[PDB]
Design a protein around this ligand. Structure first.
Ligand SMILES: NC(=O)C1=CN([C@@H]2O[C@H](COP(=O)(O)OP(=O)(O)OC[C@H]3O[C@@H](n4cnc5c(N)ncnc54)[C@H](OP(=O)(O)O)[C@@H]3O)[C@@H](O)[C@H]2O)C=CC1
Ligand SMILES: NC(=O)C1=CN([C@@H]2O[C@H](COP(=O)(O)OP(=O)(O)OC[C@H]3O[C@@H](n4cnc5c(N)ncnc54)[C@H](OP(=O)(O)O)[C@@H]3O)[C@@H](O)[C@H]2O)C=CC1
Lengths: 293, 288
């Protein structure tokens, strides 16, 4: 392939907000990078910094033995595969798909890559572009173990704290989507609180300064609730579901009187009421897991 | 030479406030509507008051931890008007509305008491913790006079100002965040479980997202302060396209998706307002 500082070639397909930064990060670490994007405008800055732009997705695939996909979704990578010569030889090449998509997409893609004699790793980026290259940054991976481990050092340029979740190409997606269900539900909750605080004359900077109290409590609460769910041990001596409900009905009242949105609080109260309906009123809040299952 | 403290309300939280004070060598007088709950505290050296009145009379620091502020207002209302609270600081750690706080502060004033409203930012197991927070607002002189005593309950107190009503909105805003986030975690843990991921394995991965959220809060708060919603990190539209895949996974697992629906409703608010291309922090402007 070649190098420069004796590093192998990598290809990046998709140069949006995330893909462009994957390419730049590899270039800056001394990797040869071939890029491809549906629209060529996005490649100009990368080309000026030493990337090669491929005219066709096929040429980007041909250029490297490590092919990183970061398009809007897995479905559009299926369309890219469909426009390849069916006999394009991907022997010795590892496709790493970092695009958001369904387990059905992953299954279809793994099959098509296998038909080309390629190796397939599914992946999920657990950060915003600004944190790519971070020692603490996580990308999730699942699929061909030999292929992942062969490219592990290269992929570590993008994220210093990767997690290999197992050999099943479909393992990454459900975990990835579950962690982002948590992340964005929690981020909406934070906004919902920041808006209530603001309505009471607490600046967003002052609410930011207090937020770690609750981030620390949530780190501990997740540990606590996970250990209880593992043990099916929902004894209510810390706090009952019923007391959680009485308290959060006061939070709702405050949101309604502030004319602040309360969709996140409505969601939590609905899960509480599920648990009460199931006779879990006296139990620990961890019992919501069983009521929700 | 430690002073007397009184605790009224010996439920899950109040019992531990009383126990923590006893164990630190404070004289503690307890009261509870039902006497069964006082037995464990009497085992550990507490004096039991027959009436709420006597618990208030017993000490110059009176800590309330009843189900809500409304029932403490009812206890106050049934006191003899000649009960004298001169030199006494009432600290109300019960969840309640700003209207409850206003009524209680008035009644305490009528008895010549000093009033501090408070909000406990932990479960009972974390009471006594050096990093544990209780929020306080109201009489500054009274709070600071009792600050050493109250520190034995929580080593990281926050005094939020002299207005007795200051604590409640911040307290409720932080719990809006905490329980919305906890429901989101449960929503994810159930999805993972439906795909055969053990709750212990989901617990082990959760810090990835807790760390990302600590950074996301800082980032979003700085953008909201600056009204700077430039979309170069990720657009609302890309957030929506991604979370519609999360929603699909929940629907196909027949798993609940109310927390995801709430986030997507805020996203759709922002899109409708023409913020599709902006940073996710723009949801604040769409919401407020
Ligand atoms: N940005 C972020 O913070 C994060 C992003 N992700 C995930 O990474 C992926 C990419 O996100 P991001 O860079 O923000 O998205 P952008 O919208 O910035 O980029 C989308 C990319 O997909 C390409 N694309 C869209 N439609 C097609 C198509 N039909 N054929 C070929 N290429 C197409 C775009 O090409 P063009 O330039 O021609 O439009 C562009 O390269 C998503 O799946 C996202 O969920 C993961 C975590 C964080
Ligand atoms: N547990 C926790 O983790 C946390 C609790 N809190 C707050 O602290 C408060 C107490 O919670 P918690 O200890 O869990 O609740 P519990 O239900 O365990 O205790 C409630 C207490 O209120 C008393 N009570 C109820 N009705 C009356 C009444 N009419 N007159 C007098 N006393 C009455 C009960 O007396 P009786 O024993 O006779 O029923 C009991 O002492 C709530 O406002 C809650 O939101 C805040 C932070 C965390």
């Amino acid at each position: 392939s070649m190098s420069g500082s004796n590093k192998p070639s990598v290809s990046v397909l998709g140069l949006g907000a995330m893909g462009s930064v994957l390419a730049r990060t590899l270039l800056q670490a001394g990797y040869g990078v071939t890029v491809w994007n549906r629209s060529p405008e996005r490649a100009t800055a990368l080309v000026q910094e030493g990337a090669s732009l491929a005219r066709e997705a096929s040429e980007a695939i041909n250029a490297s033995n490590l092919i990183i996909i970061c398009m809007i979704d897995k479905a559009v990578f299926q369309d890219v595969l469909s426009s390849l010569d069916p006999l394009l030889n991907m022997s010795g090449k590892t496709i790493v798909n970092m695009s958001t998509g369904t387990v059905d997409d992953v299954e279809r893609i793994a099959k098509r890559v296998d038909q080309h004699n390629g190796l397939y790793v599914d992946a999920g980026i657990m950060c915003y572009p600004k944190d790519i290259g971070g020692q603490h940054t996580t990308i999730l991976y699942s699929g061909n173990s030999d292929a992942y481990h062969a490219h592990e050092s290269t992929l570590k340029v993008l994220a210093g704290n990767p997690k290999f979740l197992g050999a099943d190409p479909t393992a990454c997606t459900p975990t990835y989507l579950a962690l982002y269900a948590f992340y964005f539900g929690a981020f909406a909750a934070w906004l919902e609180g920041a808006v209530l605080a603001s309505c009471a004359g607490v600046s967003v900077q002052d609410f930011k300064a207090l937020s770690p109290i609750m981030s620390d409590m949530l780190v501990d609460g997740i540990k606590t609730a996970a250990d209880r769910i593992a043990a099916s041990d929902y004894s209510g001596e810390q706090a009952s579901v019923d007391v959680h409900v009485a308290g959060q009905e006061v939070v709702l009242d405050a949101l309604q009187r502030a004319n602040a949105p309360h969709a996140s609080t409505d969601a939590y109260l609905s899960y509480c009421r599920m648990a009460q309906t199931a006779g879990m009123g006296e139990l620990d809040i961890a019992s919501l897991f069983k009521a929700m299952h």
